[PDB]
Amino acid sequence: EVQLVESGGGLVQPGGSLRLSCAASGFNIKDTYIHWVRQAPGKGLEWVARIYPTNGYTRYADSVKGRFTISADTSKNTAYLQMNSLRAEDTAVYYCAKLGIGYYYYGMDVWGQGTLVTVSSASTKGPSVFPLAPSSKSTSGGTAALGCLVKDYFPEPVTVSWNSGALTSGVHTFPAVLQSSGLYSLSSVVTVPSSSLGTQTYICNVNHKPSNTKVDKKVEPKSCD
Amino acid sequence: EVQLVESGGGLVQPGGSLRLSCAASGFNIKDTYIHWVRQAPGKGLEWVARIYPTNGYTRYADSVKGRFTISADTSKNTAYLQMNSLRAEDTAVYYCAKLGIGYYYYGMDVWGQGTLVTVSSASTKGPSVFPLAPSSKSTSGGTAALGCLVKDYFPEPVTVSWNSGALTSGVHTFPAVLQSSGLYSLSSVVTVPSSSLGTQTYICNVNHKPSNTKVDKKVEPKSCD
Amino acid sequence: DIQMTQSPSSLSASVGDRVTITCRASQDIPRSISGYVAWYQQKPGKAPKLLIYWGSYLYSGVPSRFSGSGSGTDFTLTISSLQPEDFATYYCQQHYTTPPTFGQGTKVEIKRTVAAPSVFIFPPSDEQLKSGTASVVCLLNNFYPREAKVQWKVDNALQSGNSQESVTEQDSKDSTYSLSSTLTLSKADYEKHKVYACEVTHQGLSSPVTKSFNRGE
Amino acid sequence: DIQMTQSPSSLSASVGDRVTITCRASQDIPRSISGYVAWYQQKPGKAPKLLIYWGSYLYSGVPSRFSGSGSGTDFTLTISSLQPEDFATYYCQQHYTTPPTFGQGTKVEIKRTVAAPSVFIFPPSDEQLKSGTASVVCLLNNFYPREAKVQWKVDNALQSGNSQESVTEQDSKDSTYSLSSTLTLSKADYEKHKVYACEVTHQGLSSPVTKSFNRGE
Amino acid sequence: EVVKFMDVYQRSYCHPIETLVDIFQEYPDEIEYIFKPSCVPLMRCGGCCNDEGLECVPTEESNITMQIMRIKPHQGQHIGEMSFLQHNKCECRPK
Amino acid sequence: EVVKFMDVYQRSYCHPIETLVDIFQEYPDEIEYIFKPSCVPLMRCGGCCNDEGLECVPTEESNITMQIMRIKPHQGQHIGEMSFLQHNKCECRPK
Ligand SMILES: [Cl-]
Ligand SMILES: [Cl-]
Ligand SMILES: [Cl-]
Ligand SMILES: [Cl-]
Ligand SMILES: [Cl-]
Ligand SMILES: [Cl-]
Ligand SMILES: [Cl-]
Ligand SMILES: [Cl-]
Incomplete structure (x- = not known):
C-alpha cells in the first residue's frame, strides 16, 4: 500500500x-x-x-x-x-x-x-524497570491490577507492551512525568481477571531505543507472609 | 407574384x-x-x-x-x-x-x-373571318353547333375567343392547317343549348396580332326559306 | 455531359391506372448518386409545369398521385391514379451535368369508352361567296377513339384532293376528340351543284351518319 | 497568506450529540469561493487522519456522521452523532493560499456518566530498594470525570512535595480516565515507617476510599 | 442505414446545441489559474446556414454559473463559481 | 441555479458527443464540390481529461452514411451518399 x-x-x-x-x-x-x-x-x-x-x-x-x-x-x-x-x-x-x-x-x-x-544538552540514560505487584488480597473483587514502573530514563520515548503485544485490553500506559532530576519516569498497568492467574503469566516488555534497552519483567501478585 | x-x-x-x-x-x-x-x-x-x-x-x-x-x-x-x-x-x-x-x-x-x-420569307397577311352557321333544323337534338372560319393568314398564331372570353365551355378551336397556297386556316366552334338562342348572342373574337387584325363576328343559326 | 433517354414514347391508359415513365442516363452513374432529375407536365401549347424535383420530391401544389424515384442511371415518374386532366406530354430533365438537357417526352393518352361523334355541316357564308371561294365545313364533335373517316359527296360524287382535316387534342375533362373537315371549292363549282353531304364513319356508329344541305336551301 | 482561526478551543459533549467546530479565514473571501478547507482527526500521539476535503467531501472509509460545509471565510465540521471513539483533537487546514496552514485545534471530550475510580496500591519492589530509593504507586482506574484527589499518608502523616501524578487520555471505548500517583521516598525514610496509605476523593465516591499496606506485610 | 437528406438538413440547421467549451477560451486573460474541469457543457450556436453569406449567431443569450476548481500552481486551490454565456435562440443572419 | 462541481466534472469528462462537423474538414481535398448541408451531426470525442498530459481520443470507431447535396457551381448538382467516421467509445490516453 x-x-x-x-x-x-x-x-x-x-x-x-x-x-x-x-x-x-x-x-x-x-x-x-x-x-x-x-x-x-x-x-x-x-x-x-x-x-x-x-x-x-x-x-x-x-x-x-x-x-x-x-x-x-x-x-x-x-x-x-x-x-x-x-x-x-x-x-x-x-x-x-x-x-x-x-x-x-x-x-x-x-x-x-x-x-x-x-x-537538549542532557545525556542518554536507560531506564530501570520494576514490577508493580498487587497484594493477593486486592484481587478479591475479581480484578487484579499489576504493572511495571519504568524509572529514570532520558530522552523520551519508551514503549511498553504486555505479553509481547498479545495483551492490549485493560492496558494503561501513563504519560511520562519529568522528575526534579531531569529524568523521565512512567508506569504501565493492566487489569486482568484474578481467575486468570496461574493459567496465564504476565510480562511487560519495555523498549527504550535511544539507549538500546530492551527489558522484560514478569509480574505476579505476592501474598504478605 | x-x-x-x-x-x-x-x-x-x-x-x-x-x-x-x-x-x-x-x-x-x-x-x-x-x-x-x-x-x-x-x-x-x-x-x-x-x-x-x-x-x-x-x-x-x-x-x-x-x-x-x-x-x-x-x-x-x-x-x-x-x-x-x-x-x-x-x-x-x-x-x-x-x-x-x-x-x-x-x-x-x-x-x-x-x-x-x-x-420564313413569306409575308404577313391578315385573315378573313366567316361565320359557320348551322341550319335551324340541326338544333333539334337540343344542341346547336356554330363557329367561325378564320381563313388565309400568315404567320401563326391566331387567337379566338367567344363572347369576349366569357364562353369557354364547349369551345373547340382547331389547330391551323397550312393550305397549298402557303396560308393558314382554322375553325373555332362551340356547342350551346338551342334553348339559349334568343336569350343569348354568340360572337367570336378573332385576333391576329402579326397583322393587327382584330375582328368580331356574330354567329346565329339561319333557316332555309 | 449526359443525355437522358426517356421511355416510352407514347402510351395509352385508363382513368385509375398506374402510369410509369422512365428516364435513363447515358453515362454510368453509381447507385449512391440520386436526386438529379426533374419531371415536367406540358399541356399542348402551354408552358411546362414542374411536378417532381431532385428525383423524388413533390413540388408545391401538385396532386400527390404524382411521385418519382431513382438512383444511379435510372429514374421513374409514377402517376398512381390516372385522371383525365393528366393528358399531357411529360418530360424529364437532368442537372447532374449542366446545361440541363431534356428527355424526348412521353405522350400520355387517356383511354376511355367509345363515344360516337355528333355530326354537323356548315354551308359557306354569303360573305365568302362574294370573294369567289366556297368552304364547306363538317364538324365531328366529342368522339373516342381518334380514328374517324369523313367522305364528302357533292351531288353523290365522292370527292378527293379538295379537303383538309384538323383534330383537337384530347379534352382534359371528358377525354374525347373533335374533328373539322373543310371542303374547298371555287364559287364557280359550288354554284353548279345542289346537294352537299358529309358522311362519317367511326367505330361508335353502327352505320355511316350523313349530314347534308341543299344549296340555296 | 491566510490564517485560520478555529473554534472552540475545547468542548465537552455526550454520546449521540451534534458537535460543531468552526474555522474562519483571516482575509475577506467572497461566498462564491468554497472548497479550500480540509479537516483532520488526531488521536493522542498518532498521525492525524483526513476526514473531510475540499470543504464538504467525505474522505474514503470515514463514517458518514462526519460532514463539512462552508464558503467565503466560514467553514464548519459537524459530527452528527457523537461516538466515544470520536474523542480526539480536530484540526482544519486551508489551501486557498499555500503553504497550507492549520488551525489551532479543537479538543473534543466525551461527557459520560459519573464513574468512581477503582483504587489499588503497590509497594516498592525489593529490586528497587537495593538501589536506595522507594517508589510507592497508587492507581485510580476507569473513572469519570477527570477531577480526582489523592492524599498519601505515611503512618497517618499526610505527605506533601514528594509525589507526582499522571493521567491517561480519555479511553476510546468507555470514555473514562485513569490516574497514577507515585510517592518517592529514600530507602532510609521508607524503612522508618510501617503504614503506607493512598486516600482517594472523587465525586463518584460517597466518602474517601483508602488503600494501604503494612511494610514487610 | 443511410441518413436521409431532409433529416441531415433538419438536424444540422443552425440551432443551440450542447457544446464543450474550453474555459481558457471564455476567460482568455487568466494568466494565473488552471481550471478543473478545463472545459464546460454550454448551449451554443452550432450548425450551418443555407447561404455561405449567412452565419449562425445567437439572438437570445443568458448566463449560467458553475463550480470550477481553480488551481494556482504551487500556490493553492479552491472551488469557485464561474459564469458562462449560453445561447437560448440562434438564427441565420447576414455577415 | 449553480451547477455543482461533481456534475460539471461528470458532464464534461471525455465522452462521445453529438458534434456538428464541417464536411469540407472531413474531405479536405474536395476542390470541386460545395456541400449542402455544409456540416453534419456526428458522434465524436469531446470533453477533457484529468491531466494536461492526457488527451481525449477514440478507441472504437464506425462509419455512418448520409445523403448530401453536392453542387459543382455552374456545372450541376445531385444528392450523393457520403461516409463519415463516428466515435463509439473514447478514452483518455497519453500524448
Ligand atoms: Cl457554351
Ligand atoms: Cl443550369
Ligand atoms: Cl435539351
Ligand atoms: Cl349526329
Ligand atoms: Cl519559503
Ligand atoms: Cl502545498
Ligand atoms: Cl501551520
Ligand atoms: Cl476500589
Whole structure:
C-alpha cells in the first residue's frame, strides 16, 4: 500500500544538526508535494516545509526558514529535512506527509508514524524497570491490577507492551512525568481477571531505543507472609 | 407574384436577326440562372441557352452556339436572347425560364407564356373571318353547333375567343392547317343549348396580332326559306 | 455531359391506372448518386409545369398521385391514379451535368369508352361567296377513339384532293376528340351543284351518319 | 497568506450529540469561493487522519456522521452523532493560499456518566530498594470525570512535595480516565515507617476510599 | 442505414446545441489559474446556414454559473463559481 | 441555479458527443464540390481529461452514411451518399 516511513530523529544538543528521512512506498514522489509537519509536546500541528521533487522547489515556515532545508531524491523515492541550529522550541514530533496534484490535491491522506526530535544538552540514560505487584488480597473483587514502573530514563520515548503485544485490553500506559532530576519516569498497568492467574503469566516488555534497552519483567501478585 | 414575360417574337426572313426579351417580376435575376428553352412545332423541348446575370457567364446548345447570344441587364431585371443567322429549323416557341441557386436550384418552376418565332420569307397577311352557321333544323337534338372560319393568314398564331372570353365551355378551336397556297386556316366552334338562342348572342373574337387584325363576328343559326 | 433517354414514347391508359415513365442516363452513374432529375407536365401549347424535383420530391401544389424515384442511371415518374386532366406530354430533365438537357417526352393518352361523334355541316357564308371561294365545313364533335373517316359527296360524287382535316387534342375533362373537315371549292363549282353531304364513319356508329344541305336551301 | 482561526478551543459533549467546530479565514473571501478547507482527526500521539476535503467531501472509509460545509471565510465540521471513539483533537487546514496552514485545534471530550475510580496500591519492589530509593504507586482506574484527589499518608502523616501524578487520555471505548500517583521516598525514610496509605476523593465516591499496606506485610 | 437528406438538413440547421467549451477560451486573460474541469457543457450556436453569406449567431443569450476548481500552481486551490454565456435562440443572419 | 462541481466534472469528462462537423474538414481535398448541408451531426470525442498530459481520443470507431447535396457551381448538382467516421467509445490516453 501507499506509505511513508520516517527515520533519523533522536536527541541532539542545542546548536546541533539532524537529518530526517522519509521513504515513500506505493507511489512516486515525483507526482506529489512532500511536507513536514511538527507537533511540539501538548501543542498544535505546525506546517514546517514543502518540496516539489521534480523541480526541487521549496517553501518553509518563518520559524525554520534559513535553518532547515527540505529536499527529495526522486530515484530513491525519499525526502529529507536537514535541520541546522536547533533550539529548545524545535523539540517536537516530526511528521512526513504527502499531498497529490490537481484532482489529487485534497489533503494529507498519507502520514508517517512521526519521529521525536529532542533538543537538549542532557545525556542518554536507560531506564530501570520494576514490577508493580498487587497484594493477593486486592484481587478479591475479581480484578487484579499489576504493572511495571519504568524509572529514570532520558530522552523520551519508551514503549511498553504486555505479553509481547498479545495483551492490549485493560492496558494503561501513563504519560511520562519529568522528575526534579531531569529524568523521565512512567508506569504501565493492566487489569486482568484474578481467575486468570496461574493459567496465564504476565510480562511487560519495555523498549527504550535511544539507549538500546530492551527489558522484560514478569509480574505476579505476592501474598504478605 | 413571381413571373416571367417574354416579348419580341414574330416573323423573320432566313438569315435575319431577332431579339427576344424576358422581364422578371417578384424576384431578382441576380440570384438566378435564366434559361431559354424552345419547342419546334410538334417536337420536344430543347434547352438553348443560359446566363448567370451577376458575372455574365453564358452557355449555349451546339445547335445555336455562335449564332445566338444570351445576356441579362440586372438593373432592368430583364434577360435577352439575340438571334442571328436564322434558319427554318429555328422556327419554334421560345420560352424563358428561371432556375434558383443552391437549395433554390430544383427545376424550372417559373416559365414565361412562350413567344412564337417563325423563320420564313413569306409575308404577313391578315385573315378573313366567316361565320359557320348551322341550319335551324340541326338544333333539334337540343344542341346547336356554330363557329367561325378564320381563313388565309400568315404567320401563326391566331387567337379566338367567344363572347369576349366569357364562353369557354364547349369551345373547340382547331389547330391551323397550312393550305397549298402557303396560308393558314382554322375553325373555332362551340356547342350551346338551342334553348339559349334568343336569350343569348354568340360572337367570336378573332385576333391576329402579326397583322393587327382584330375582328368580331356574330354567329346565329339561319333557316332555309 | 449526359443525355437522358426517356421511355416510352407514347402510351395509352385508363382513368385509375398506374402510369410509369422512365428516364435513363447515358453515362454510368453509381447507385449512391440520386436526386438529379426533374419531371415536367406540358399541356399542348402551354408552358411546362414542374411536378417532381431532385428525383423524388413533390413540388408545391401538385396532386400527390404524382411521385418519382431513382438512383444511379435510372429514374421513374409514377402517376398512381390516372385522371383525365393528366393528358399531357411529360418530360424529364437532368442537372447532374449542366446545361440541363431534356428527355424526348412521353405522350400520355387517356383511354376511355367509345363515344360516337355528333355530326354537323356548315354551308359557306354569303360573305365568302362574294370573294369567289366556297368552304364547306363538317364538324365531328366529342368522339373516342381518334380514328374517324369523313367522305364528302357533292351531288353523290365522292370527292378527293379538295379537303383538309384538323383534330383537337384530347379534352382534359371528358377525354374525347373533335374533328373539322373543310371542303374547298371555287364559287364557280359550288354554284353548279345542289346537294352537299358529309358522311362519317367511326367505330361508335353502327352505320355511316350523313349530314347534308341543299344549296340555296 | 491566510490564517485560520478555529473554534472552540475545547468542548465537552455526550454520546449521540451534534458537535460543531468552526474555522474562519483571516482575509475577506467572497461566498462564491468554497472548497479550500480540509479537516483532520488526531488521536493522542498518532498521525492525524483526513476526514473531510475540499470543504464538504467525505474522505474514503470515514463514517458518514462526519460532514463539512462552508464558503467565503466560514467553514464548519459537524459530527452528527457523537461516538466515544470520536474523542480526539480536530484540526482544519486551508489551501486557498499555500503553504497550507492549520488551525489551532479543537479538543473534543466525551461527557459520560459519573464513574468512581477503582483504587489499588503497590509497594516498592525489593529490586528497587537495593538501589536506595522507594517508589510507592497508587492507581485510580476507569473513572469519570477527570477531577480526582489523592492524599498519601505515611503512618497517618499526610505527605506533601514528594509525589507526582499522571493521567491517561480519555479511553476510546468507555470514555473514562485513569490516574497514577507515585510517592518517592529514600530507602532510609521508607524503612522508618510501617503504614503506607493512598486516600482517594472523587465525586463518584460517597466518602474517601483508602488503600494501604503494612511494610514487610 | 443511410441518413436521409431532409433529416441531415433538419438536424444540422443552425440551432443551440450542447457544446464543450474550453474555459481558457471564455476567460482568455487568466494568466494565473488552471481550471478543473478545463472545459464546460454550454448551449451554443452550432450548425450551418443555407447561404455561405449567412452565419449562425445567437439572438437570445443568458448566463449560467458553475463550480470550477481553480488551481494556482504551487500556490493553492479552491472551488469557485464561474459564469458562462449560453445561447437560448440562434438564427441565420447576414455577415 | 449553480451547477455543482461533481456534475460539471461528470458532464464534461471525455465522452462521445453529438458534434456538428464541417464536411469540407472531413474531405479536405474536395476542390470541386460545395456541400449542402455544409456540416453534419456526428458522434465524436469531446470533453477533457484529468491531466494536461492526457488527451481525449477514440478507441472504437464506425462509419455512418448520409445523403448530401453536392453542387459543382455552374456545372450541376445531385444528392450523393457520403461516409463519415463516428466515435463509439473514447478514452483518455497519453500524448
Ligand atoms: Cl519559503
Ligand atoms: Cl457554351
Ligand atoms: Cl443550369
Ligand atoms: Cl435539351
Ligand atoms: Cl349526329
Ligand atoms: Cl502545498
Ligand atoms: Cl501551520
Ligand atoms: Cl476500589
